[PDB]
Amino acid sequence: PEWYKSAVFYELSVRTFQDGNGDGKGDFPGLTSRLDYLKNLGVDCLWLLPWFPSPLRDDGYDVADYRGIHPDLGTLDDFKVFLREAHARGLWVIGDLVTNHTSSDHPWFQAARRGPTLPDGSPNEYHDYYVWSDEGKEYADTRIIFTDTEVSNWTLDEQAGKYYWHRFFASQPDLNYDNPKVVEELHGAARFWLDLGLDGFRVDAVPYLIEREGTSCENLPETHEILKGFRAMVDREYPGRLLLAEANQWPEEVVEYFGTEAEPEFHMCFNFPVMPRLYMSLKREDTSSIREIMGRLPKIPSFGQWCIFLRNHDELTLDMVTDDERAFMYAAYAPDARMKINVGIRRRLAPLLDNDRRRIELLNTVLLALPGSPVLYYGDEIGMGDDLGLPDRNGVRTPMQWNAGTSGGFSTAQPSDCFFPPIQDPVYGFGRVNVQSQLQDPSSLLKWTARQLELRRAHPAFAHGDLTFIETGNPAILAFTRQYDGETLLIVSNFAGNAQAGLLDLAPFVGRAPVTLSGASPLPVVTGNGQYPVVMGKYDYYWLRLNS
Amino acid sequence: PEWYKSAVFYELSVRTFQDGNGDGKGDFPGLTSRLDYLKNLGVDCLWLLPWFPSPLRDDGYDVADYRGIHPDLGTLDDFKVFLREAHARGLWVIGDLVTNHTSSDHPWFQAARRGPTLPDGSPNEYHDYYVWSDEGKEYADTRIIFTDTEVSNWTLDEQAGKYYWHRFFASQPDLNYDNPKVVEELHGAARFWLDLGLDGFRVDAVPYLIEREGTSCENLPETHEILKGFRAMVDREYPGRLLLAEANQWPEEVVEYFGTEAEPEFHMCFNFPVMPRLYMSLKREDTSSIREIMGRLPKIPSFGQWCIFLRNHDELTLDMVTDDERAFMYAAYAPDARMKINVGIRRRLAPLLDNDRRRIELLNTVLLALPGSPVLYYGDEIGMGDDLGLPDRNGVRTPMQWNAGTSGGFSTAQPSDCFFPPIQDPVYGFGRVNVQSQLQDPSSLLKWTARQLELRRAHPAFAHGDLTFIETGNPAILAFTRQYDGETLLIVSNFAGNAQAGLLDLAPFVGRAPVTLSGASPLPVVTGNGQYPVVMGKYDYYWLRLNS
Ligand SMILES: OCC1=C[C@H](N[C@H]2C[C@H](CO)[C@@H](O)[C@H](O)[C@H]2O)[C@H](O)[C@@H](O)[C@@H]1O
Ligand SMILES: OCC1=C[C@H](N[C@H]2C[C@H](CO)[C@@H](O)[C@H](O)[C@H]2O)[C@H](O)[C@@H](O)[C@@H]1O
Ligand SMILES: [Ca+2]
Ligand SMILES: [Ca+2]
Ligand SMILES: [Mg+2]
Ligand SMILES: [Mg+2]
C-alpha cells in the first residue's frame, strides 16, 4: 500500500519546537537536532506549520512568499539540511500550502491594490490575482469564520478604492481562483517544494477557494475541479507524494475531497466530523454520537486514507455539530468565556480532560484504533497544557517543553523573550511537564504514548482494517472490530468514569478466543449465542484479537 | 467502638515535615502550621517518629532522654501547643516509645558503663539497667537485624570492660527487663507523655525485650508478659489510649501481641505479614500469596484492630518471607545493589511501582479495603520519591514537598542546609511533586487519595467489616467481601498489567445487584448459581456494594 496509509503523523511549528541560536525563536537547526526524539517516539511523518516569510499576523498562515524560508526559522540551507537529516532517519516531512489566500504584505497584493491600470496606462496583470468588488454587496448569504475579529468578509483598501474578499483575517486577501494565472502560481509554489524533496502538503482551507453568487462559497464543484487539477499535477510530475486536505465540513461534503477513483483529489483528509464527537461523548458517557457520524461517512476511494486527530494548532472547532451539541460542548469544556473562540474551544488536550491521564490515554487509544492514520499534536504526547492569556489560538502553541532549564529547554533566552511564553503554571509548567522527566519516568505519558504506538505498529489492521461497530448493551461502551489480512481486532473502550457492564454481540465469532493485544492473555471463548458479557473499569480500553 | 478502629493514621517525622524557623530542621512550630493540611486530607491520627533528645545515630530511635523534646524540634512548650492544636481539629496524636533500648549517650548507660562497683566501693545501681556479658558467648543462636553493619549482637565496652547486648546498633544498648527498675522506668516514660494528653503510643521492637538462653530471644513469653503489664497500667490509669505494636513476625506469633480477651496486650499491631505479599503478588500477577498469608492470620481479640500499611520510614522488610520469595523481590524491586539494606529494599512506594499511578492506586485501594485501620506514610500521597545517596534508611525520609519554592517549601533554608536534602531529581523532585501543585491539578494523586479516603468514610464495612474471600478462577484477580451492619461490599482488584477475566463465586448473593460505590452504576444481577462473570482492565479496582 501507500506510505501515508501506515504512517503516524506529528504536527509541530518550527518557530516553537526548538531554538538553536538562542534568539527566542524556534529554528530549522533546532528542529533538526530533535529528529532523534521524534523517531524514537514512533513518529513517521512530521507536518510543519507554515515556514514562509510573513508578518505572522495569523502566525504565518498569512504567507508573504511561497518560495523562501522565514528568517525567524533559519535559511533555505537550514531547510535543505533539515529535510535531508529527516530523510536519513526515515521520516517523511510535509508542509502547509496556504492556497486560499496570501498576506496583504505579499508582493502580489502590494501591486494588486495599485489599480487595474498602472501609471503608464497598461493593465496591471496582478490586480486580477485577488477578488475585488466596488460596493461589496456580492457573495452575501455567506458565513463569517473569524467572527470575533471580522465584521465583513469584504474590506475596503484605502488605495485600491475597492473592496477585496477574505474568508479569514482582513490581512489575508483571498486569491481569485477563477484566474488561471493563479492556479499556475500555486502549481508553481507547490512544485518549488516538491522539487526540493518534500514528501507532500497539507492544503489549508480547501472548501473556500472559489466563490459563486447564490451559493455558500464552500465545497463548490468549481473548487473541487481546481483541487483535481492539483492532484493531477502532483500525480503526473511527482508520483508518491502526499496531498492532505483540511476540510471541516459535514460527513458527505468532506468525502467529496477525496475525489473519485476516476477523478482523484486528496490522498487523505482530516476526519473533522468525529473529533468533536469524541469529546462530547466522553462527558455524556454516551458513545452514540461517535457511532452515528461514523456511519454517515460515505466510503472513500481506494487511494484515500483518513487522518484521525484529537487536537491541533487551532481551536476545538464546533461548527459542524448541532446547536444542542455545541451548547453542550461549551458547558462541559468551556467554563471560562475566555476559552471560547470563533465557535470553538481554544484549549490544549490535557486541560480539556482536566489533566486526567486515564482520559488522556483513552482518547489516544481510540485515535489509534479508529480507521485512518493518527496525528499527534506536538507536546500533547507529554501532557502540555495551554495559556489562554495569549491572543487568538496561540494559547495552545507555546514552546515545547524539553526540560526544567531555561525556558523549558526550548531556548537559552529568558521566557519573557521567547516568541510565545513557555508555560510555567504550577500544573502544566515546564518544571513539571517536560521531556527530560518523562524519559526518566518509567510510566510517563511519553513512554506510554510510545509503547502504544509500538503496539499499533505491530497490527496493520489498525492502519488498513475495515470498521465494524459491535453492540454492547451500554451506551458508555464503544466496541468495534477491525479486519485485514486474516487478523481481526476487537477494540472495546469505556467512555465512563466508573465501572460499566456490557453485553457484546460476538455472535459472528462463536468459537473464537479474544486475547489481549499485549500480554498474550486469553479471555473466555465466545460461546452459544455470542452475547459476550463484559465489565469495564473507568475509562478503560481493551485492545483484543480474535484468533480462529 | 474505640477510635483507632475508625482512624486513618498518617506517619510523619517532625524533623523532616515542616521547618518553622529557617534552621534547616523541621520543628513543632512548623508542623503545627500544617495541621489543616492533614485534617483536610482525611487523616485522623498522627504517628510522630521519635521526637526525644538523641545523638541521632539511628534517626532518634536511639533515645537519650525519654522526657524531653529534642532541641532540633523545639521545646516541651512547642510540643504542648502542637498537641493542643492537633486535638482542636479532632486529630489524635501518638508518639514513638522506644522500649527495647536507649542510646549510648543516655545517662543510664553512661552510668551503667562505669561498672558494677563505683569508685567509693558501693554498688552501681545503674549497671543492671543493661544486659552485660563477660565474654559475649551467651544468646548464641540469635539473629542479627542490622546485618549490613553489626557483626554480632554483643559489643565490648572500652570502659565497662565487658560486653553489652544490643539487638540493633551498637550505639543502642538493650535495656534489661529482668530488672524491675527498668520495667518501672518504662512505665514512668509512658506516664509522662500520656499525662501530657498524648493519645497513645506506637511501640518499637516489642518482640526483642527479654532474652533467654536456648531461644531466639524473640516473641518470648517473658516478653509478652511485660507487654501485658504495660497494657494493664494504661487501661487502668489512662483509659482509651492506644498501644500500637511493631511486631514483624510470622502470622501465629504476630497475633500473640494482642493478648487474649482476659489478658490484653496491644490494641493494634501492624499487618507486617501481608505487606510484602502485595508487592510480590503485583509482580507475579498472582494474588494467592495474599489469600494464603492473610488466611494464616488467626482471629484477633474484640479490642484488636489491624493497622494496614504499604511503606514506612524503614526498608521494605523481607526477613519474614521464604528465601525463594525474598530472592524474587530483590530481582523484582532492587535491580541496583544500592537498593538493598539489611534483608530488605530501601525504596519509596512510587519508585517501587516504577511511578505508575495505576499500580500506586491499586495498592492504595487494597490498603484501604483490607480489614484494619490504614496508615499512610507522609509524602506517599503526592508520589514522593526516594534519595538512595543517603545512608541507612534516610533515603525515604527526605523533607516534605510542599511547594516548588525554596527547598520544596519545607524550609526557607537552602536545600544544602536542611537535615536531609529535599529531593530535586527530574521525576520525583519538588518542581514536579509537591502539595501546592497537586491542589490545583484537578486529578492529582493528592486529590485522588483524599477522595478515596472520603469514599471509604461512607462505608464502615471497610473499618469494621469481616472479610470473606471470593474465588475467581484467575489468580490475577483478587476478590473479597466486607460485611458490616447490613452493607455487603464486594471488592475486586486486578493485579495484572493487561485485561483479565474471572468467574466470581457470588453464590451466597444470588438476586443481589452489584452497583459501584461511586455513582452506583449497576452490574448484572447475580442470577443462577452465582458464578458471576467479570472482566477487568490492568490495575483495575471495582468497589461495589450488593444490596438486597
Ligand atoms: O472552520 C474550519 C477551520 C479552519 C481554519 N483553519 C485554517 C484557517 C487559517 C488559514 O489562514 C489559519 O488561521 C489556520 O491556522 C488554518 O488551520 C480555522 O481557523 C479553524 O478555526 C477551523 O477549525
Ligand atoms: O523486622 C522488623 C524491623 C524492625 C526494626 N524497626 C525499628 C528498629 C530501630 C529501633 O531503634 C529503628 O531503626 C527503626 O526505625 C524502628 O522502626 C528494623 O529497623 C526494621 O528495618 C525492620 O523492618
Ligand atoms: Ca477564495
Ligand atoms: Ca532487649
Ligand atoms: Mg531562530
Ligand atoms: Mg526548626
Coordinates of N, CA, C and O in Angstrom, one line a residue, chain B residues 227-286:
Chain B
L227 N 4.7 -7.1 78.4 CA 3.8 -6.3 77.5 C 2.4 -6.3 78.0 O 1.7 -5.3 77.9
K228 N 1.9 -7.4 78.6 CA 0.6 -7.4 79.3 C 0.5 -6.3 80.4 O -0.4 -5.6 80.5
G229 N 1.6 -6.3 81.2 CA 1.6 -5.3 82.3 C 1.6 -3.9 81.8 O 1.0 -3.0 82.5
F230 N 2.3 -3.6 80.7 CA 2.2 -2.3 80.1 C 0.8 -1.9 79.8 O 0.3 -0.8 80.1
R231 N 0.1 -2.7 79.0 CA -1.3 -2.6 78.7 C -2.2 -2.4 80.0 O -3.1 -1.7 80.1
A232 N -1.8 -3.2 81.1 CA -2.5 -3.2 82.3 C -2.5 -1.9 83.0 O -3.6 -1.4 83.5
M233 N -1.4 -1.2 83.0 CA -1.2 0.1 83.6 C -2.0 1.2 82.7 O -2.5 2.1 83.2
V234 N -1.9 1.0 81.4 CA -2.5 2.0 80.5 C -4.1 1.9 80.6 O -4.8 2.9 80.5
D235 N -4.6 0.7 80.6 CA -6.0 0.5 80.7 C -6.6 1.0 82.1 O -7.7 1.5 82.2
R236 N -5.8 0.9 83.1 CA -6.2 1.4 84.5 C -6.0 2.9 84.6 O -7.0 3.5 85.0
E237 N -4.8 3.4 84.3 CA -4.5 4.8 84.6 C -4.9 5.8 83.5 O -5.3 6.9 83.8
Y238 N -4.9 5.3 82.2 CA -5.2 6.2 81.1 C -6.2 5.5 80.1 O -5.8 5.2 79.0
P239 N -7.4 5.3 80.6 CA -8.3 4.6 79.7 C -8.5 5.2 78.3 O -8.4 6.4 78.1
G240 N -8.5 4.3 77.3 CA -8.8 4.7 75.9 C -7.6 5.0 75.1 O -7.7 5.1 73.9
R241 N -6.4 5.1 75.7 CA -5.2 5.4 74.9 C -4.9 4.2 74.0 O -5.5 3.2 74.1
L242 N -4.0 4.4 73.0 CA -3.7 3.4 72.0 C -2.2 2.9 72.2 O -1.3 3.7 72.0
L243 N -2.1 1.6 72.4 CA -0.8 1.0 72.2 C -0.8 0.2 70.9 O -1.6 -0.7 70.7
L244 N 0.1 0.6 70.0 CA 0.3 0.0 68.7 C 1.7 -0.6 68.6 O 2.7 0.0 68.9
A245 N 1.7 -1.8 68.1 CA 2.9 -2.7 68.2 C 3.5 -3.0 66.9 O 2.8 -3.3 65.9
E246 N 4.9 -2.9 66.8 CA 5.7 -3.2 65.6 C 6.2 -4.6 65.8 O 7.4 -4.8 66.2
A247 N 5.4 -5.6 65.4 CA 5.8 -7.0 65.6 C 5.9 -7.7 64.2 O 4.9 -8.3 63.8
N248 N 7.0 -7.5 63.5 CA 7.2 -8.2 62.2 C 7.6 -9.6 62.4 O 8.8 -10.0 62.4
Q249 N 6.6 -10.5 62.7 CA 7.0 -11.9 62.7 C 6.1 -12.7 61.8 O 5.4 -12.2 60.9
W250 N 6.1 -14.0 62.0 CA 5.3 -14.9 61.3 C 3.8 -14.8 61.8 O 3.6 -14.3 63.0
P251 N 2.8 -15.2 61.0 CA 1.4 -14.9 61.4 C 1.0 -15.3 62.8 O 0.4 -14.5 63.5
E252 N 1.3 -16.6 63.2 CA 0.9 -17.0 64.5 C 1.5 -16.1 65.6 O 0.8 -15.7 66.5
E253 N 2.8 -15.8 65.5 CA 3.5 -15.1 66.6 C 3.1 -13.6 66.6 O 3.0 -13.0 67.7
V254 N 2.8 -13.0 65.4 CA 2.4 -11.6 65.4 C 1.1 -11.4 66.2 O 0.9 -10.5 66.9
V255 N 0.1 -12.4 66.0 CA -1.2 -12.2 66.7 C -1.1 -12.4 68.2 O -2.0 -11.9 68.9
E256 N 0.0 -13.0 68.7 CA 0.1 -13.1 70.1 C 0.2 -11.8 70.8 O -0.2 -11.7 72.0
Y257 N 0.7 -10.7 70.1 CA 0.9 -9.4 70.7 C -0.4 -8.6 70.9 O -0.3 -7.5 71.4
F258 N -1.5 -9.2 70.6 CA -2.8 -8.7 71.1 C -3.2 -9.2 72.4 O -4.2 -8.7 73.0
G259 N -2.6 -10.3 72.9 CA -3.0 -11.0 74.1 C -4.4 -11.7 73.9 O -4.9 -11.7 72.8
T260 N -4.9 -12.2 75.0 CA -6.3 -12.8 74.9 C -7.3 -11.7 75.4 O -6.9 -10.6 75.8
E261 N -8.5 -12.1 75.5 CA -9.5 -11.2 76.0 C -9.4 -11.0 77.5 O -9.6 -9.9 78.0
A262 N -9.1 -12.1 78.2 CA -8.8 -12.0 79.6 C -7.5 -11.2 79.9 O -7.4 -10.4 80.8
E263 N -6.5 -11.4 79.1 CA -5.1 -10.8 79.3 C -4.7 -10.0 78.1 O -3.9 -10.4 77.2
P264 N -5.2 -8.7 78.0 CA -4.9 -7.9 76.8 C -3.5 -7.4 76.7 O -2.9 -7.1 77.8
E265 N -3.0 -7.4 75.5 CA -1.6 -6.8 75.2 C -1.8 -5.5 74.4 O -2.2 -4.5 74.9
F266 N -1.6 -5.5 73.1 CA -1.7 -4.3 72.3 C -3.1 -4.2 71.7 O -3.8 -5.2 71.5
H267 N -3.5 -3.0 71.5 CA -4.8 -2.7 70.8 C -4.7 -3.1 69.4 O -5.6 -3.7 68.8
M268 N -3.6 -2.7 68.7 CA -3.4 -3.0 67.3 C -1.9 -3.2 67.1 O -1.0 -2.8 67.8
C269 N -1.7 -4.0 66.0 CA -0.3 -4.3 65.5 C -0.4 -4.1 64.0 O -1.4 -4.3 63.4
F270 N 0.8 -3.7 63.5 CA 1.0 -3.6 62.0 C 0.8 -4.9 61.3 O 1.4 -5.9 61.8
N271 N 0.1 -4.9 60.2 CA 0.0 -6.2 59.4 C 1.2 -6.4 58.6 O 1.1 -6.4 57.3
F272 N 2.3 -6.6 59.2 CA 3.6 -7.0 58.5 C 3.5 -8.2 57.6 O 4.1 -8.2 56.6
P273 N 2.7 -9.3 58.0 CA 2.8 -10.5 57.1 C 2.2 -10.3 55.7 O 2.5 -11.1 54.8
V274 N 1.3 -9.3 55.6 CA 0.6 -9.2 54.3 C 1.3 -8.2 53.4 O 1.3 -8.3 52.1
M275 N 2.1 -7.3 54.0 CA 2.7 -6.2 53.2 C 3.5 -6.7 52.1 O 3.2 -6.3 50.9
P276 N 4.5 -7.5 52.3 CA 5.4 -8.0 51.1 C 4.7 -8.9 50.2 O 5.1 -9.0 49.0
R277 N 3.6 -9.5 50.6 CA 2.8 -10.4 49.7 C 2.1 -9.5 48.6 O 1.9 -10.0 47.5
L278 N 1.8 -8.3 48.9 CA 1.1 -7.4 47.9 C 2.0 -7.0 46.8 O 1.7 -7.1 45.6
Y279 N 3.3 -6.6 47.1 CA 4.3 -6.2 46.1 C 4.6 -7.5 45.3 O 4.7 -7.4 44.1
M280 N 4.9 -8.5 46.0 CA 5.3 -9.8 45.3 C 4.1 -10.2 44.4 O 4.4 -10.6 43.3
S281 N 2.9 -10.1 44.8 CA 1.8 -10.6 44.0 C 1.4 -9.7 42.9 O 0.7 -10.1 42.0
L282 N 1.8 -8.4 43.0 CA 1.7 -7.5 41.9 C 2.7 -7.8 40.8 O 2.3 -7.8 39.6
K283 N 3.9 -8.2 41.1 CA 4.9 -8.6 40.1 C 4.6 -9.9 39.5 O 4.6 -10.1 38.3
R284 N 4.3 -10.9 40.3 CA 3.9 -12.2 39.9 C 2.6 -12.2 39.1 O 2.2 -13.2 38.5
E285 N 1.8 -11.1 39.2 CA 0.4 -11.1 38.6 C -0.4 -12.2 39.2 O -1.4 -12.7 38.5
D286 N -0.1 -12.7 40.4 CA -0.8 -13.8 41.0 C -1.0 -13.5 42.5 O 0.0 -13.2 43.2

